Write a protein that binds this ligand. Structure first.
Ligand SMILES: Nc1nc2c(ncn2[C@@H]2O[C@H](COP(=O)(O)OP(=O)(O)OP(=O)(O)O)[C@@H](O)[C@H]2O)c(=O)[nH]1
Ligand SMILES: Nc1nc2c(ncn2[C@@H]2O[C@H](COP(=O)(O)OP(=O)(O)OP(=O)(O)O)[C@@H](O)[C@H]2O)c(=O)[nH]1
Ligand SMILES: [Mg+2]
Ligand SMILES: [Mg+2]
Ligand SMILES: [Mg+2]
Length: 348
């Protein structure tokens, strides 16, 4: 049935030891930053972001520690201190609590844990005064401070008053109106320069949460499936798009009301081929806006040839996928998927 996709997904998700390591690690990091006295006046919030938070991360090959992105929200005035000087403020904290285990990775700090690799970006709140104070109430809320992932909290709402269900009302509290957060993203260091850029991790999480529910929980699992395909055919595929550029392209192609993984995949693949045919013939790339900062093109760093090589790769995958979804021979159908996904996709 559709159970073959459930076993395959449990095989590509990060393992429970990694899961328990990034939950306690982020919790231990959050308490340390809040209690640390030279940073007891600056740290506003420490929360999990990224594919770990959005349940779009696949387990790495060869037992390498998965990348777990973490945001430290500060109350610093980003107009009076540059990101290097803001990251320099956390150097003593790192030496004391995470000695010989951290490293400055330019835009972010890397913390090597037992099973995971923490990726920390120091961020500041653009707002000020009573407007800043209302945003800090959101970053100190259970909505943001939750260490559970989107697959575990399908009812997740972006709201300072929202509490998670106890599986038995603050849980019924809906997403905060866009006027409170949509145009108020955080700022982080540039990948290369000593200048603040703009990021909106919460908005990306809220779009992913809404898109997941609209696709009957299949959206995050389809992103994991395609990321797995991209890793198992990496020798026939170009180095980009990978990671969030790839995930964003799947959230664009996949349509609302997805009934099954089998029907979800070919649909998003067919739509990727139909939608970008006019852009691929001109040997060009699309310009998709980010769910967080709308004035940002998620594919800004993707080369135009890179995307057209990927478009060619999806066409090769499309032949297998359509055969496997239409094949009614269980010996041929389950074999067909494994040509796309490798051995981790199991038989009936
Ligand atoms: N809008 C936008 N956000 C990005 C982009 N790259 C990274 N991000 C954000 O930064 C977060 C972490 O970056 P990465 O760890 O490099 O991307 P990732 O997909 O989470 O990495 P893995 O899942 O571990 O493979 C992502 O979840 C995004 O929210 C980008 O190109 N555009
Ligand atoms: N929270 C978070 N956001 C990220 C991360 N990495 C990238 N982003 C967001 O994704 C956008 C694209 O990231 P990059 O590809 O590194 O772009 P950049 O070189 O840093 O800056 P520009 O190219 O000038 O926009 C950034 O503007 C960030 O807002 C991350 O690790 N954490
Ligand atoms: Mg990541
Ligand atoms: Mg990262
Ligand atoms: Mg840059």
């Amino acid at each position: 049935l559709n159970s073959q996709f459930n076993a395959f997904l449990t095989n590509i998700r990060p393992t429970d030891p990694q899961k328990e390591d990034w939950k306690g690690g982020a919790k231990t990091l959050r308490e340390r930053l809040n209690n640390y006295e030279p940073l007891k006046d600056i740290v506003v919030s420490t929360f999990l972001q990224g594919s770990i938070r959005r349940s779009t991360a696949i387990r790495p090959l060869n037992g390498k520690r998965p990348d777990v992105d973490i945001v430290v929200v500060t109350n610093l005035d980003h107009n009076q201190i540059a990101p290097q000087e803001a990251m320099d403020l956390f150097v003593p904290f790192l030496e004391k609590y995470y000695p010989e285990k951290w490293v400055p990775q330019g835009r972010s700090f890397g913390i090597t844990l037992s099973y995971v690799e923490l990726d920390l970006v120091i961020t500041a709140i653009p707002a000020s005064g009573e407007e800043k104070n209302l945003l800090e109430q959101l970053y100190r809320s259970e909505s943001v401070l939750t260490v559970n992932s989107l697959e575990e909290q399908k009812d997740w709402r972006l709201n300072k008053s929202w509490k998670p269900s106890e599986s038995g009302n603050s849980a019924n509290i809906q997403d905060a109106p866009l006027s409170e957060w949509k145009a108020h993203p955080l700022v982080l260091p540039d990948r290369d320069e000593n200048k603040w850029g703009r990021t909106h991790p919460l908005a990306q999480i809220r779009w992913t949460a809404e898109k997941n529910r609209a696709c009957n929980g299949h959206y995050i699992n389809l992103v994991r499936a395609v990321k797995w395909w991209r890793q198992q055919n990496s020798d026939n595929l170009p180095k980009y798009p990978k990671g969030y550029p790839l995930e964003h392209l799947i959230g664009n192609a996949l349509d609302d009301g997805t009934p099954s993984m089998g029907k979800g995949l070919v649909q998003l693949i067919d739509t990727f081929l139909s939608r970008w045919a006019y852009v691929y013939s001109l040997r060009s790339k699309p310009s998709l806006p980010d769910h967080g900062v709308e004035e940002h093109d998620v594919l800004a760093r993707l080369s135009a040839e890179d995307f057209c090589l990927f478009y060619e790769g999806l066409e090769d995958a499309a032949i297998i996928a359509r055969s496997a979804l239409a094949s009614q021979d269980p010996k041929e159908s389950a074999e067909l998927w494994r040509k796309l996904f490798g051995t981790k996709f199991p038989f009936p």
